């Protein structure tokens, strides 16, 4: 769905502020203030390859960066989707205690 019908590669680029509190970064200094993360989806290739300041990396590096930015995708608090909205709709006190 993301890939344009006909085009081989679909590209998203996202730029964030950088601070000297996150490790395992490529090409980017701690004093630098720019983190550029690029995701490309193509039909022919089936692998998890991301880009950090336009440098190819495995998804593990970007995942551990996301972990070190105190932001989480699986957790429902940081990200809310339709299924997650439905799950919050019928929410028990035990789930509140768990969170």
């Amino acid at each position: 769905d993301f890939i344009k019908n006909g085009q081989d590669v679909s590209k998203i680029e996202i730029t964030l502020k950088n601070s000297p509190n996150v490790t395992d970064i490529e090409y980017i200094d701690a004093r630098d203030e720019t983190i550029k993360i690029t995701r490309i989806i193509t039909r022919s290739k089936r692998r998890s390859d991301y880009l950090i300041n336009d440098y190819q990396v495995s998804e593990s590096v970007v995942k551990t960066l996301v972990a070190q930015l105190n932001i989480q995708l699986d957790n429902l608090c940081q990200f809310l989707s339709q299924e997650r909205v439905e799950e919050f709709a019928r929410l028990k006190s035990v789930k509140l205690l768990v969170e």
Partner: peptide, 26 residues
């Protein structure tokens, strides 16, 4: 003079925020 877009200076923006997003071939 020639029109210049606002400078995406990340220092002014709060840490962890996003200034410019590029969407290609969607």
């Amino acid at each position: 003079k020639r029109v210049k877009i606002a400078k995406p200076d990340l220092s002014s923006f709060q840490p962890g925020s996003i200034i410019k997003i590029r969407l290609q071939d969607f």
